[PDB]
Amino acid sequence: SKPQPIAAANWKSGSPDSLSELIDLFNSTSINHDVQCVVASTFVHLAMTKERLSHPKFVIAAQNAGNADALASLKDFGVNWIVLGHSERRWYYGETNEIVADKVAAAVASGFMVIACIGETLQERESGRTAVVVLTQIAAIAKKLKKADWAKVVIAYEPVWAIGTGKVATPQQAQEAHALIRSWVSSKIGADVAGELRILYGGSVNGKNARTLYQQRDVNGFLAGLKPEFVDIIKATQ
Numbered sequence: 001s002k003p004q005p006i007a008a009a010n011w012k013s014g015s016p017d018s019l020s021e022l023i024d025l026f027n028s029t030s031i032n033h034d035v036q037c038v039v040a041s042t043f044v045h046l047a048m049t050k051e052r053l054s055h056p057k058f059v060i061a062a063q064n065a066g067n068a069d070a071l072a073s074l075k076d077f078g079v080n081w082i083v084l085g086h087s088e089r090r091w092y093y094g095e096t097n098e099i100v101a102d103k104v105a106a107a108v109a110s111g112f113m114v115i116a117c118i119g120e121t122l123q124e125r126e127s128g129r130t131a132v133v134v135l136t137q138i139a140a141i142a143k144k145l146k147k148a149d150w151a152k153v154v155i156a157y158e159p160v161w162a163i164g165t166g167k168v169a170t171p172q173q174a175q176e177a178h179a180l181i182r183s184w185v186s187s188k189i190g191a192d193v194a195g196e197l198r199i200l201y202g203g204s205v206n207g208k209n210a211r212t213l214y215q216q217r218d219v220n221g222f223l224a225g226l227k228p229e230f231v232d233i234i235k236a237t238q
């Protein structure tokens, strides 16, 4: 009754790893269960990653494209997935809920599967404003989409305090977050949509923590940093 899990790998600069070697590792990895694996990379590595990742349960995702011609070109190039709204887009680049929403709408229109990221800050979490922050974030996204559009959409729930910090959310925190996201999608979009929607957890997921997190009722996989432990995160999606 859970939808198809997704294990998404999100590439970031100054990774100590070789991308190529990580691709080689992923290519060798047998994945017995049904899961869509996604290697999201930055522009300059898109061509190398496409060239080189041939695991068929893997798709390449672009990241943060917001231009008509660039979306169109990525699609041309055979890139069908895109990650958008990721934490630093919001807290650093100044991408508002609306800018992310418009990027998500543009990508869907261009035939992309979209991993749309949402998530609260340390401060937002601490003052109990997680729900309102994250529901505001997704509400902005939902405003720009139509019901059919949700088939192309994936939500990555990422607490900002958990991204890259070694501080993972607890199964109860991830479940609470995912549950309210899905409750909101249910009530505001439809229970068929909430039902089919992949809500992924991200922020300091590793091998050990992942399977407990995937056990949670509303967790449909993970958005994780592209690192060799990602393989163990893939396995946890059962």
Ligand SMILES: [Cl-]
Pocket (backbone or CB within 6 Å): 030, 031, 032, 033, 234, 235
């Ligand atoms: Cl497996």
